[PDB]
Design an enzyme around this catalytic site. Structure first.
Site, short mmCIF file in Angstrom:
data_model
loop_
_atom_site.label_atom_id
_atom_site.label_comp_id
_atom_site.label_asym_id
_atom_site.label_seq_id
_atom_site.Cartn_x
_atom_site.Cartn_y
_atom_site.Cartn_z
CB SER A 45 61.42 49.62 27.42
OG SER A 45 60.92 50.84 27.94
CE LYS A 48 60.83 52.64 25.07
NZ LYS A 48 61.48 52.84 26.40
CB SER A 105 65.30 52.69 27.18
OG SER A 105 64.20 51.80 27.32
CD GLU A 141 56.88 53.73 26.69
OE1 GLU A 141 56.66 53.81 27.91
OE2 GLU A 141 57.45 52.76 26.15
CB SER A 212 62.48 48.32 34.40
OG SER A 212 62.71 49.71 34.23
O1 LIG Z 1 64.20 55.71 33.90
C1 LIG Z 1 63.88 54.62 34.22
N1 LIG Z 1 62.64 54.32 34.90
C2 LIG Z 1 61.67 55.34 35.25
C3 LIG Z 1 61.50 56.48 34.50
C4 LIG Z 1 60.56 57.42 34.88
C5 LIG Z 1 59.79 57.19 36.00
C6 LIG Z 1 59.96 56.04 36.74
C7 LIG Z 1 59.10 55.77 37.97
N2 LIG Z 1 57.77 55.99 38.05
N3 LIG Z 1 57.38 55.62 39.30
N4 LIG Z 1 58.46 55.19 39.96
N5 LIG Z 1 59.53 55.27 39.13
C8 LIG Z 1 60.90 55.10 36.37
C9 LIG Z 1 64.80 53.45 33.92
C10 LIG Z 1 64.85 52.35 34.76
C11 LIG Z 1 65.72 51.31 34.45
C12 LIG Z 1 65.80 50.11 35.37
N6 LIG Z 1 65.47 50.13 36.65
N7 LIG Z 1 65.68 48.88 37.12
N8 LIG Z 1 66.15 48.11 36.14
N9 LIG Z 1 66.23 48.89 35.04
C13 LIG Z 1 66.52 51.38 33.33
C14 LIG Z 1 66.44 52.48 32.50
C15 LIG Z 1 67.31 52.56 31.27
F1 LIG Z 1 66.75 53.37 30.34
F2 LIG Z 1 68.53 53.05 31.59
F3 LIG Z 1 67.46 51.34 30.71
C16 LIG Z 1 65.59 53.53 32.80
O1 LIG Z 2 58.34 54.55 32.14
C1 LIG Z 2 58.65 53.90 33.07
N1 LIG Z 2 59.93 53.24 33.15
C2 LIG Z 2 60.93 53.31 32.12
C3 LIG Z 2 61.09 54.42 31.31
C4 LIG Z 2 62.08 54.42 30.34
C5 LIG Z 2 62.89 53.32 30.17
C6 LIG Z 2 62.71 52.22 30.99
C7 LIG Z 2 63.59 51.02 30.84
N2 LIG Z 2 64.28 50.72 29.74
N3 LIG Z 2 64.95 49.60 30.00
N4 LIG Z 2 64.69 49.21 31.24
N5 LIG Z 2 63.84 50.11 31.80
C8 LIG Z 2 61.74 52.20 31.97
C9 LIG Z 2 57.70 53.68 34.24
C10 LIG Z 2 58.12 53.12 35.44
C11 LIG Z 2 57.18 52.95 36.45
C12 LIG Z 2 57.55 52.37 37.79
N6 LIG Z 2 58.76 51.93 38.17
N7 LIG Z 2 58.62 51.51 39.46
N8 LIG Z 2 57.35 51.67 39.85
N9 LIG Z 2 56.69 52.21 38.81
C13 LIG Z 2 55.86 53.31 36.28
C14 LIG Z 2 55.47 53.86 35.08
C15 LIG Z 2 54.02 54.24 34.84
F1 LIG Z 2 53.95 55.38 34.11
F2 LIG Z 2 53.44 53.22 34.15
F3 LIG Z 2 53.38 54.38 36.03
C16 LIG Z 2 56.38 54.04 34.06
#
Ligand SMILES: O=C(Nc1cccc(-c2nnn[nH]2)c1)c1cc(-c2nnn[nH]2)cc(C(F)(F)F)c1
Ligand SMILES: O=C(Nc1cccc(-c2nnn[nH]2)c1)c1cc(-c2nnn[nH]2)cc(C(F)(F)F)c1
EC number: 3.5.2.6
Length: 263
Positions: A45, A48, A105, A141, A212
């Site tokens: 992200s 963005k 995000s 995304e 992330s």
């Molecule tokens: O929503 C998140 N992630 C997400 C969303 C949808 C699916 C999966 C997924 N897919 N497969 N496994 N998980 C993971 C997410 C994670 C982090 C993060 N994690 N660690 N450090 N920062 C921070 C944020 C934010 F927005 F608050 F900044 C959002």
């Molecule tokens: O969309 C995701 N994450 C997310 C979404 C929104 C905000 C943030 C964020 N913003 N700031 N920090 N994190 C992060 C995401 C996470 C994983 C994941 N996590 N662990 N294992 N797989 C895998 C995927 C996918 F689709 F590619 F398979 C997407």
């Protein structure tokens, strides 16, 4: 040569088990500190920022563009839509989408920015227009966050991202009012307190964008106003060898702390 700071970053990286990339620009003297600065990392992200900036650039010749409505349909919702889901069957303006993408995000909001630019390649084209030959956005995304080791898609280097963030937020890649709007958005980010910010003195002001994704990828890019000196730009990227690894925002804070000590 290897500096004291680079040696400490290597020790941090060794203890983390992952791969760490850092780039600092100190705008007081324009000097740089880099660690794996020319290696590629998945942006997640942090990309963005480039998309929002590309829309700001478009708005320089369209004074009403940021008020343009965009339809939010249920099918547009992806995997993390904290703002956009409230407006299904309604609309959001490009300003609202930019704010949601940067400050919350929101992934649906990011997809609307990408679509306004004609797809991922429109974001890459903007990067090239502002002198960034390294950045590439290949997917929308949520798949741009897969973060597979060795995959070139949706990557940049720490050096290139720090240079670009400097030009966008402190330089003249954008018009003056657009640059101010980008800085305001970054300064109001809600997601950043555990990342670069956590490694810096509390008296400093920070605007940042986190990311992330897969492989425990944990990223942050920041513009920093330290008490009583010129601004800094700092990029910290981190990724791990196993797909399901837990994120490590503390490693980004630790990298920022080492950088701040070395100034
Ligand atoms: O929503 C998140 N992630 C997400 C969303 C949808 C699916 C999966 C997924 N897919 N497969 N496994 N998980 C993971 C997410 C994670 C982090 C993060 N994690 N660690 N450090 N920062 C921070 C944020 C934010 F927005 F608050 F900044 C959002
Ligand atoms: O969309 C995701 N994450 C997310 C979404 C929104 C905000 C943030 C964020 N913003 N700031 N920090 N994190 C992060 C995401 C996470 C994983 C994941 N996590 N662990 N294992 N797989 C895998 C995927 C996918 F689709 F590619 F398979 C997407």
């Amino acid at each position: 040569q290897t500096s004291a700071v680079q040696q400490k970053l290597a020790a941090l990286e060794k203890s983390s088990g992952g791969r760490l990339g850092v780039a600092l620009i100190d705008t007081a003297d324009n000097t740089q500190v880099l660690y794996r600065g020319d290696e590629r990392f998945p942006m997640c992200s942090t990309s963005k920022v480039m998309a929002a900036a590309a829309v700001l650039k478009q708005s320089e010749t369209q004074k009403q563009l940021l008020n343009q409505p965009v339809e939010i349909k249920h099918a547009d919702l992806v995997n993390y839509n904290p703002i956009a889901e409230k407006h299904v069957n309604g609309t959001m303006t490009l300003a609202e989408l930019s704010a949601a993408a940067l400050q919350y995000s929101d992934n649906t909001a990011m997809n609307k920015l990408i679509a306004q630019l004609g797809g991922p390649g429109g974001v890459t084209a903007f990067a090239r227009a502002i002198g960034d030959e390294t950045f590439r956005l290949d997917r929308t995304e949520p798949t741009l966050n897969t973060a597979i080791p060795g995959d070139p898609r949706d990557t940049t280097t720490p050096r290139a991202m720090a240079q670009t963030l400097r030009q966008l937020t402190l330089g003249h890649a954008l018009g003056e009012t657009q640059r101010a709007q980008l800085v305001t958005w970054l300064k109001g980010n809600t997601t950043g307190a555990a990342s670069i910010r956590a490694g810096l003195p509390t008296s400093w002001t920070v605007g940042d964008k986190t990311g992330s994704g897969g492989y425990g990828t944990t990223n942050d890019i920041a513009v920093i106003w330290p008490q009583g000196r010129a601004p800094l730009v700092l990029v910290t990227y981190f990724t791990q060898p196993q797909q399901n690894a837990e994120s490590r925002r503390d490693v980004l804070a630790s990298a920022a702390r080492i950088i701040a000590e070395g100034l």
